[PDB]
Amino acid sequence: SHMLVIHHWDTDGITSAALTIKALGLDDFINIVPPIGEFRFDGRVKKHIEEAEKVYILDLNLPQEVEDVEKDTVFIDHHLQKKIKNPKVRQVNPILERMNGKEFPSASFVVSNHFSLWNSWSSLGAVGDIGNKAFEIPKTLELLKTEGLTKNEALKLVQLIDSNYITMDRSAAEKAVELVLNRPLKELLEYEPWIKNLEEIERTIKDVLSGIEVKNDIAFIEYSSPFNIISKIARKAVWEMGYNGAVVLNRSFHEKAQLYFRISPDLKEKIDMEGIIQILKNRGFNAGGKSEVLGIIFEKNRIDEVLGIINGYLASL
Numbered sequence: 611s612h613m614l615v616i617h618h619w620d621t622d623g624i625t626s627a628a629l630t631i632k633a634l635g636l637d638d639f640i641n642i643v644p645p646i647g648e649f650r651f652d653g654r655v656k657k658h659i660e661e662a663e664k665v666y667i668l669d670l671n672l673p674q675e676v677e678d679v680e681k682d683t684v685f686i687d688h689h690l691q692k693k694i695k696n697p698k699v700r701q702v703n704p705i706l707e708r709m710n711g712k713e714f715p716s717a718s719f720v721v722s723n724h725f726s727l728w729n730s731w732s733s734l735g736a737v738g739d740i741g742n743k744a745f746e747i748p749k750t751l752e753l754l755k756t757e758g759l760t761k762n763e764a765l766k767l768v769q770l771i772d773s774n775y776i777t778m779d780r781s782a783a784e785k786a787v788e789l790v791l792n793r794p795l796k797e798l799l800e801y802e803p804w805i806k807n808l809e810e811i812e813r814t815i816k817d818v819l820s821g822i823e824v825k826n827d828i829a830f831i832e833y834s835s836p837f838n839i840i841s842k843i844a845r846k847a848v849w850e851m852g853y854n855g856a857v858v859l860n861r862s863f864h865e866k867a868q869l870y871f872r873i874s875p876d877l878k879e880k881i882d883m884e885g886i887i888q889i890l891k892n893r894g895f896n897a898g899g900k901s902e903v904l905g906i907i908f909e910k911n912r913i914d915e916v917l918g919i920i921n922g923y924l925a926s927l
């Protein structure tokens with residue numbers, strides 16, 4: 611009786627949701643996100659699934675939860691993940707399907723290719739996942755050009771849209787899909803509620819950047835905060851400050867710990883980020899990522915365990 615669209619909480623997932631909603635010609639939909647930084651379906655998500663008729667899951671590297679879905683489901687993602695056995699799920703992943711993953715930098719590009727619907731939201735998703743490197747793909751700037759948007763304007767839009775999930779606002783992150791659907795991107799650059807979020811986030815990121823240390827050109831950044839800034843801290847440490855690797859640890863993310871391990875393409879060969887994921891998953895950790903980035907949420911008492919595993923690989927550099 612309803613159309614459900616579960617999607618990631620960042621720009622990549624929010625643009626993917628808008629692209630999916632537009633391509634399907636939906637006039638009656640429910641779009642939700644799982645709890646930020648929990649990487650699992652909670653009660654709220656599970657109830658919507660039972661009520662909805664068809665479900666779309668976008669940019670959510672959590673197959674173990676999709677495996678149990680008893681609805682007709684299309685699962686689109688670009689993370690490195692395991693093949694889903696559930697027959698009710700139609701998995702669309704241009705990594706499992708063996709195709710090149712550099713052709714698909716973000717879920718937005720995967721969704722666009724899936725529906726053959728290319729607009730500026732396609733670009734935003736790419737910028738929200740690989741940042742400035744998305745502009746080295748000609749499709750990005752060209753689509754941004756139609757809407758008369760500059761490089762910086764899209765980078766600013768990623769910060770504004772991301773500002774919702776960083777501030778832990780499930781409702782504002784979900785509503786961002788309606789605003790992208792119903793307002794030009796260049797209008798949302800003026801959207802005051804997002805702007806107010808971003809001012810408080812930059813101010814608090816500077817604090818974490820002040821207490822960073824370094825070894826072997828690897829940045830070790832430890833902090834405690836309820837904001838989900840761990841994604842940007844790892845990027846800022848590697849992408850902007852130029853370090854070869856960043857290990858970011860949040861000790862008090864809402865009664866749980868949170869660690870991120872991002873490397874530069876230079877170390878992408880020397881470090882097997884895929885293997886480190888499997889080792890963490892085998893050990894019962896809620897871990898996922900890509901070939902250059904690591905994300906974990908776990909119990910506070912396993913912080914030393916996690917650090918030992920990663921300092922393990924870091925010791926062979």
Ligand SMILES: Nc1ncnc2c1ncn2[C@@H]1O[C@H](COP(=O)(O)O)[C@@H](O)[C@H]1O
Nearest residue numbers: 649671841896897898899903905906907
């Ligand atoms: N516990 C987890 N389970 C599955 N995927 C994760 C997890 N933690 C982080 N990720 C993914 O890792 C990617 C890298 O984060 P980021 O560098 O901020 O884009 C993100 O797209 C996350 O979705």
